[model samples]
Target: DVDKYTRARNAGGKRAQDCMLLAAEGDSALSLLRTGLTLGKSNPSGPSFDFCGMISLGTNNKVLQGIVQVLGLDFNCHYKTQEERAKLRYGCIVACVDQDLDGCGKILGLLLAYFHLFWPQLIIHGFVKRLLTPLIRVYEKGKTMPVEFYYEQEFDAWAKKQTSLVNHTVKYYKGLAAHDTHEVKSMFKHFDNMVYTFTLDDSAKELFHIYFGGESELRKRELCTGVVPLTETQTQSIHSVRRIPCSLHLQVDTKAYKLDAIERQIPNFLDGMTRARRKILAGGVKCFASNNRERKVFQFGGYVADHMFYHHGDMSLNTSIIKAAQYYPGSSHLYPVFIGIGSFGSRHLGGKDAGSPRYISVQLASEFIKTMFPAEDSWLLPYVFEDGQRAEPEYYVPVLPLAIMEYGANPSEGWKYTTWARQLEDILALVRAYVDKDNPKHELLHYAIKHKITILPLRPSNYNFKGHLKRFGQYYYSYGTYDISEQRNIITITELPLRVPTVAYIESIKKSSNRMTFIEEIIDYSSSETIEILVKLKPNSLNRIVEEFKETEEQDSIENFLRLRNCLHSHLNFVKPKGGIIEFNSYYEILYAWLPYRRELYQKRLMREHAVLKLRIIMETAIVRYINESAELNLSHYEDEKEASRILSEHGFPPLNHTLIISPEFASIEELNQKALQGCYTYILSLQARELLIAAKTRRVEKIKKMQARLDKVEQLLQESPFPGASVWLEEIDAVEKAIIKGRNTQWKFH
Candidate 1:
């Protein structure tokens, strides 16, 4: 009993212009739906393996022409700028593809990209859409309703977690072409709900330019699923279009998607965290202390969402929490903050293939708070609610830039960032070496001091290096090593570039070998965690390698010098607090900023502690006096809680001094159930009065020591920071060397 709607099966080019329609709620104006066009290169003028291709080729296509005819538009207006979309009388274009292997979303990616070419306003106003028809449906045992997944990757992830597939009926929709008479009607009604709208923003536009524009050959593989050999016409036509200004990358999103996305994806330079990761750590430090047992990661996620007011879903929060704890050698944190108790994820296993949050447990690493977020130092941090009861620090200050150095993925940088992570010890060593000679001087100044020793009168110096990278400092560097054996005429690629997955690389090589004659064959002799590809060379290739490859490799192995991008903070920036984006020139500058900021906070903590300790010492002294006098002689009647203070003031009690103000803390609990009895007085200590006085003094002394140690460490840390004088970070230079050595060692040691 589905609702009424309209469909025109006889849609595209003659037998193939392949168009269809789905009118919303029986109305002709909602949207037009396209069915699968006939496939095969031999099926003349039918759909080619040209989803992205055909769409962006201007209005010459039969399908675009067919679409124009259905919309009652003029084909003559190619670059139709007469507020052209105002002439559109329908809702949007909804394409229905197999939703299977070829992933035809790339096809849709092109169609709207083409639409954006001239009539961008239409795409902006939500005119382009696609049907996310369920690719897999699971009907569990006792449930009539089925669980649907639009992506096979999405479904497989959920499937792996299930112990039994016993009573589940799984449906694979082969283009939704197989259906009963009523089932077909049922689909039309459900189809409107399945429509996913597209929104193009500045980020999306940049991606479209990168993937769908000129030099797309380099990036098209990433955007596409299947690549069939293109006909000469198909191949040459892509080059015919002029390069675009790089936008109109379509996003499949709804209600405020972009806003929350940026917050989670990009990290700040100061704390080196996305807002989501910050909240998780803040709540984690509070919830799981050093003594506590491992707790379910999901429970912690719920508390953050519930207590800290997370404006996102639990599902997303779960992913963030897992990634923070996971031990994926290349893709995850080098030193994870949280110690994962179960399968957080693995490099051989994917993030999606990890165990569910319900079963997995997590806890913060030992001394995590002491090292990353010292409790006494919290006065330096800004809280979400400082004056109220439930306060949480906005983000913690750590001894080092852990997130920036360990993990760099953030939205602005394509959500993928890497560093020479395992070289943490080496980076620490650089700081140590710089410190042994001169700590306060700049790296260059130290070099000048140690070697040249010249003191010159100088004004403010602006002398410096030019910008290192383009568009917010993202640069790619080669990773991994290769072995060319002349004895066997084989080149074994034992490692992959950074951010490149092992399985993915192996598969790419498999596809690549048949086309490139130099590579005679590919043998995926790889392990779960290792990539060992045997690339046997042809006779000419082996002969040429000694001259061609070895010539380049005379200095070092050339193929090992392939690259993948790593991102850096835009001007050493932090993206929150007051202004949304705050940029700084140096990490050493950031160190000074934090150093001075924490100094005041340490002072506040001390002054506050001193005041409270003095108050306790006095109060305990008074209480001991009362006990010594054997006072049943205590006054029975007092109008206020501060009466004790008033009586003492009138008596010779030395008037609680300048900083000593006592509150009857325990009495308040006994009298008022401990609910905000703010200024009540306590006569002070008990039989343990002497202990109280000693305890207060000891506590203050201990605090002073704790804070001193921290400041000492802070200075100890920055001593080698400037090195000779000028540097973004000395780590970049040596860390690259350390990372490269490991890359070479990985290939060398594999034998």
Candidate 2:
């Protein structure tokens, strides 16, 4: 079935003698295969080979002979014995499975699993150094030829550039099986020498195990969260403070385990979610960029004593501060300070000497700033000095209590702006006193005025720092904890009686509606007479309002005139015109109050309903489990029955009271056994229903455990090894697992 006509078209070069490209039976596969077949064909000078049979179905001997024949070596054409062919170089097998289909993914995995298990010697002996290949082809728009990506770096480099190639049409192959001779021949033209030579490193092997292993499912789930190791580019992305000028420095009792936990806490500080700021700002304000891009800053700081400080190394606290100064040049004008707390120390790592000083010298710090940031005029330490001398370090202690002043019950009735403004003035005065004009630190005030030198607050003690920063400036936060234990509370049917929408889903609908309503209201109110009158009011004048209101017939604005008019009307034996129904005084007020109130009410209702449904499911599952477990047991004696009754009663089910009413006394053993089996079936179906509902909501694999447990019980109860009519449950389990895998693969996008 191999096409040899195109051999004349590709006659000069030798065939790929190093390894044979393995692929599955598909059109994409054939296209690649046909290309390889005609790579150096049609001329006497080109390498020749026999028409070998399909590799996927090849026996070990057949594969061995095929390899030898393709390499321009006489495999003796065909080995007489399997043992002789087994000695042939099996390392030359290079897999080129299609990248488009799911089956192709498994096909490659199965082939690798085979080599890794049965033919381990080939891989271990360095025969198959680089065997697996992922062919990435991106066709640039208006270009006939598609560029192939052999290395990840190649693809990443191309992807980052602002070029036409970035906007190219990309196509992936599933299997190299179905293509014309010329299409197949043309495919290999793009395959470079490095393509077949590349191999998996140690980390990649570990990743394969993590992704494909059943026991590593939890790890797979953890990977779904934004918790992976940061790349160099990602590490630098956090250092720039364009949106929020504040940087959080964490230098507490840090263990490796606490890094993630502490990092999470940083978000709380930056996002103004801490207990203190919540009182100052009426509500948590999630700031968005001009283009609606979310501000995300995640910088890992504080170096170990033994760690080297280089241009490209992990940034220490000192480096972070210097870099912050570099980017925010006017930092000195503001109160340029590092908010240091207690116990800021370092580890020497792996039992090395721990005699290093806790802090670096000003000279050393300056040199680092110059060496690392050569392009920028980064002035950091001069602002920290008193009278421009490093030896004379001064501290500016706050005079006022740095807590938000609460005036009224309403959140909006606080002296928020006044407190912040006063604190800002006080901080400025203190900084100016130290870094004054005569001291040659005159630029501090100038820089502060232009680019505010905010605090780099590092918390040694895990105190409520939310209050501390509110007095200074806004923050960019990262929280340290992810407590999933809240979902552990046992829910019962009595607590929740309605099936409500999830708070998240309901809020989405409300938010969309509110957004639309706000847009429409703005359009309608743009040219309204009432707003125009308010806009035309004289600037900053209170007495002019009395004259303006007297000129109008508005009810609330002309109350005195209405009262006198009413008295006159009574004397004249005439009733004054009845006032019309009152509406909101201003459209702005309606937009602010009415729409938000409706959205809030709708959200609360949804939350109430969702809670009910979740609790109902939990209660039903518990009841089913208890009944099924209790029914399966046979209490032989009265004392045994009494003991069982006590256990059941403890779980809110009195055995005699509830069981007697539901189960009743059985006439025979057959009837009793049948009833128990029916109950077990019912419980199984109940659990399955709950699982389906849960899957529909979260689509997470963790929920599959309960379903798996139910299935296991069902299997145990049935006499037949594969229970009759159990295909439905099995299919569901399979589908859920597949979906979980798919989710796990795509979950990294969120990160």
The model with the greatest TM-score is: 1
lDDT of 2: 0.28
| Local distance difference test values of all predictions, in order | 0.48, 0.28
Q: Model 1's lDDT to the true fold?
A: 0.48
Query: Lowest summed-lDDT stretch of 10 residues in model 2?
Result: 567-576
Estimate, for each residue in 43-158, the C-alpha lDDT of model 2 and write its tens digit: 33322232221233123555444433432233124334444334442324445554323332344444444444344444443333222233456767777766755333455676
RMSD of each: 18.3, 33.3
Look at candidate 2 and tell me the lDDT of residue 561.
14
Q: After superposition, how far is residue 2 of candidate 1 from its true place, in Å?
A: 19
Error of 1 at 510 (Å): 3.4
Cα RMSD of predicted structure 2: 33.3
